[PDB]
Amino acid sequence: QASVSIDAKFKAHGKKYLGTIGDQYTLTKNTKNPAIIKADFGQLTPENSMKWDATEPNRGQFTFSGSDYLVNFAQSNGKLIRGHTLVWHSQLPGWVSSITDKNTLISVLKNHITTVMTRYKGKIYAWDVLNEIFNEDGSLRNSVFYNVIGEDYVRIAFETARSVDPNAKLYINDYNLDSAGYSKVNGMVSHVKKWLAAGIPIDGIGSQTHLGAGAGSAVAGALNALASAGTKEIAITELDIAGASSTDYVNVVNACLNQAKCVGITVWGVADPDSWRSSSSPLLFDGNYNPKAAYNAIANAL
Ligand SMILES: O[C@@H]1[C@@H](O)[C@H](O[C@@H]2CO[C@@H](O[C@@H]3CO[C@@H](O)[C@H](O)[C@H]3O)[C@H](O)[C@H]2O)OC[C@H]1O
Ligand SMILES: O[C@@H]1[C@@H](O)[C@@H](O)OC[C@H]1O
Numbered sequence: 046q047a048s049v050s051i052d053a054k055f056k057a058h059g060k061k062y063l064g065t066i067g068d069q070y071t072l073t074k075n076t077k078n079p080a081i082i083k084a085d086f087g088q089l090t091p092e093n094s095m096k097w098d099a100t101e102p103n104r105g106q107f108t109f110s111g112s113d114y115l116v117n118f119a120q121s122n123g124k125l126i127r128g129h130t131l132v133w134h135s136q137l138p139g140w141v142s143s144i145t146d147k148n149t150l151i152s153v154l155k156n157h158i159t160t161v162m163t164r165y166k167g168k169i170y171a172w173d174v175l176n177e178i179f180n181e182d183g184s185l186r187n188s189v190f191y192n193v194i195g196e197d198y199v200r201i202a203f204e205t206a207r208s209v210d211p212n213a214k215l216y217i218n219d220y221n222l223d224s225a226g227y228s229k230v231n232g233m234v235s236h237v238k239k240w241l242a243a244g245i246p247i248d249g250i251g252s253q254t255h256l257g258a259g260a261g262s263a264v265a266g267a268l269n270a271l272a273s274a275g276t277k278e279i280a281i282t283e284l285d286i287a288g289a290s291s292t293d294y295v296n297v298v299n300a301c302l303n304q305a306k307c308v309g310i311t312v313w314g315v316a317d318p319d320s321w322r323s324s325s326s327p328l329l330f331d332g333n334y335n336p337k338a339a340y341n342a343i344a345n346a347l
Contacts, residue, residue, distance in 0.1 A: 046077070046080045046081045046083070046084035046085060047081070047084070047085050047336040047340055047341075047344070049085075049341075049344045050084055050085045050086075050087075051063050051085055051086075051340065051343050051344050051347065052064065052085055052086050052087035052088075053087075054344055054347035055298075055302075055309075055310070055347055056087065057347065058302055058347060060301070060302070060307070060308060060309055060310075061088075061125065061170075061308040061309045062086075062087040062088035062125050062170075062308075062309040062310075062311075063086060063087060063088075063298075063309060063310050063311075063312075064086045064087055064088025064089055064090065064124065064125065064127075064309065064310070064311045064312070065082060065086045065088075065089065065090075065311060065312045065313075065314065065315050066089065066090045066091070066092045066283075066311065066312075066313055066314055066315075067079075067082060067089050067090075067091065067092060067115060067118070067119075067315075068091055068092045068093055068094050068111060068114070068115050069094075069111060069114050069115070071092070071315070071319050072114075072115075072118055074319075075334065077316075077334035078315055078316065078319070078334060079118075081315050081316075081330060081334060082122075082124070082315060083122050083124075086124070086312075086315075087123075087124060087125060088119075088124055088125040088126065088127060088170070088309060088311060089115065089118070089119040089124045089125070089126055089127070090126070090127040090128075090129050090282070090283075090311050091111070091112055091115040091116075091126075091128070091129060092313075092314075092321075093111070093136070094111030094112040094114070094115050095112045095115075095128050095129055095130065095131075095161065096129070096130060096133065096136040097131075097133065097136060097137045097138060097141065097157065098136045098137065098138055099111055099112070099136075100112060100157070100160075100161050101138070101157050101160070101161075102138055103138075103140065104140050104153065105156065107160055107161075109164060112161075112164075112165075116165055116168060120168055125170040126165075126168060126169050126170055127169070127170060127171045127172070127173065127216075127282070127311060128161075128162070128165065128169045128171070128172040128173065128213070129172075129173045129176070129218070129282075130172075130173040130174075130175075130176040130218065131157065131158050131161060131162070131172060131173065131174050131175070131176075131202065131206065132154065132158070132174060132175045132176065132178075132190060132198070132202050133175075133176040133177060134177065134178075134186065134188035134189065134190070135176075135177070137189075141153060141189065142189040144189065144193065145193065146193075147193055147194055147195075150189070150190070150193045150194055151194060151198075151201060154190065154194070154198065154201060154202065154205075155201070155205050158174075158202060158205045158206055158209065159205060159209050162206060162209040162210045162213070163209055163210070165210075166209070166210045166212075167210065167212050169210065169212075169213045170213065170214060171213055171214035171215075171216050171248075171249065171251075171280075172206060172210070172213045172214070172215060172216060173216050173217075173218040173251055173282070174202050174203055174206045174215050174216060174217065175199065175202055175203075175216075175217045175218070176218045176219070177218070177219050177220065178190075178191070178199070178217070178219070179219055179229055179232050179233060179236075180229075180232075181221060181228060181229050182228045182229070182232065183228045183229055183231050183232020183233070183235070183236075184232065185236075199217075199240060199245060200240070200243070200245045203215055203240075203245050203246045203247055204245070204246060206246070207246040214248040214249050214277070214278065215246055215247055215248045215249070216247075216248065216249045216250065216251045216280070216282075217233075217237065217247055217249075217250055217251065218250075218251035218252075218253060218282055218283075219233060219250075219251070219252070219253065220252075220253035220254070220255050220283070221253075222250075222252040222253075222254075222267055222271060223252070223254060223256060223260060223263055223264055223267050224260075224263035224264075224266065224267050225263075225266035225267050225269060225270035226266075226270070227267070230267060230270050230271065231270075233250060233271065233274065234270060234271060234273055234274045237250060237274035237275070237276060238273075238274055238275055241274070241275050241276070247276055248276060248277045248278065249276050249277060249278040249279055249280060249308070250271050250274055250276050250279045250280075251279070251280050251281075251282035252267065252268070252271060252279065252280070252281055252282060253281075253282050253283040253284075253313075254281045254282070254283060254284045254285075254297065255283060255284075255285055255313070255322070256284075256285070256286045256287065256293065256297075257286070257287050258286065258287045258288035258290060258293060259293065260286070260293070261286060261290075261292060261293030261294065261295075261296030261297045261300075262292075262293075262296045264281075264296060264297050264300040265296070265299065265300035265303065265304070267300075268281075268300050268301065268304040268306075268307055269304060271306075272304060272305075272306045276306070277306075278306050278307070278308045279304070279306045279307055279308070280301075280307060280308050280309050280310070280311070281297065281300075281301055281307065281309075281310040281311065282311050283311060283313040284297060284310055284311065284312045284313055285312065285313045285314060285320060285322055285325075285327035285328060286327055287322070287325035287326075287327050288325065288326070288327070289317075289326055289327055289328060289329065289337055289339045290339065291338050291339045291341075291342030291343075292342075293339075294329070294339040294342060294343055295339075295342050295343060295346045297310070298310065298343050298346060298347070299346065302347070312328065312329060313327075313328075314327075314328045315328065315329070315330050315334075316328055316329075316330040316331060316332065316334045317330065317331055317332055318332050329343070
């Protein structure tokens with residue numbers, strides 16, 4: 046744990062949280078990881094326990110041991126929770142992707158959203174209702190949901206989520222929304238404008254922000270462009286930067302800090318060894334679970 050909590054410092058500026066991710070293994074692999082999370086971050090996103098493959102491995106049969114643990118840990122430690130993720134084409138059981146009947150798929154989709162959301166009803170700050178539904182060019186990704194149900198799945202997902210748990214912020218999450226002008230950013234903005242105008246309950250847009258070195262500076266304008274979609278809020282949801290330079294990190298923190306709609310930042314991991322992009326040492330704590338320069342830089346920028 047670092048003495049100065051960047052979550053405390055971020056919140057000091059009116060932001061909701063500066064969090065990270067977790068699950069059983071990392072929360073218990075050593076003493077430092079859970080200690081870091083408790084002392085320096087104020088929110089948690091399950092790294093894998095709430096995905097479709099881990100919650101409903103078989104049709105109508107749910108497995109919540111993993112998710113229960115992550116939720117219980119966060120609730121027990123005053124950490125906000127972002128559920129992740131209800132509808133995605135990746136980490137999706139073959140039983141789902143094989144459905145060819147529209148109504149059957151809609152029934153399955155609704156039951157999955159309803160069961161998963163109902164279980165943690167009132168404990169989730171935000172839910173990534175839909176994840177990565179766009180092609181890089183801004184067009185809708187032809188996933189089973191899109192192919193079988195069509196664009197109406199977007200409405201179905203959000204409306205269902207909205208009624209099941211009216212207390213959670215409903216988000217659409219995606220990566221590569223890292224620079225204003227980018228095709229995917231334009232596709233996200235235009236589609237959401239249309240969906241909001243249609244009455245689809247989309248409270249926020251989540252920008253993953255999985256960056257390469259030097260891409261930090263463009264994030265500010267990206268956030269500015271996303272803000273034009275007209276959602277209640279937006280957030281940096283899965284932050285990591287190859288090289289983990291202080292400049293890149295401070296640029297990203299400032300990008301959110303200086304944008305009114307950005308409610309928070311979630312770094313995709315605590316320490317490098319546990320990073321899904323570990324070879325690039327993209328996180329704020331090193332292999333010894335000690336703060337890196339970027340962590341301190343961030344604290345000093347706030
Ligand atoms: O079951 C195993 C998985 O748990 C593990 O891979 C995870 C894949 O997702 C990673 O998180 C995603 C990062 O990419 C973004 O596009 C998504 O929004 C995130 O959900 C997570 O970090 C990995 O651990 O290994 C593969 C399976 O065997
Ligand atoms: O933002 C991540 C990035 O690495 C993308 O290219 O591949 C998976 C994403 O989640």
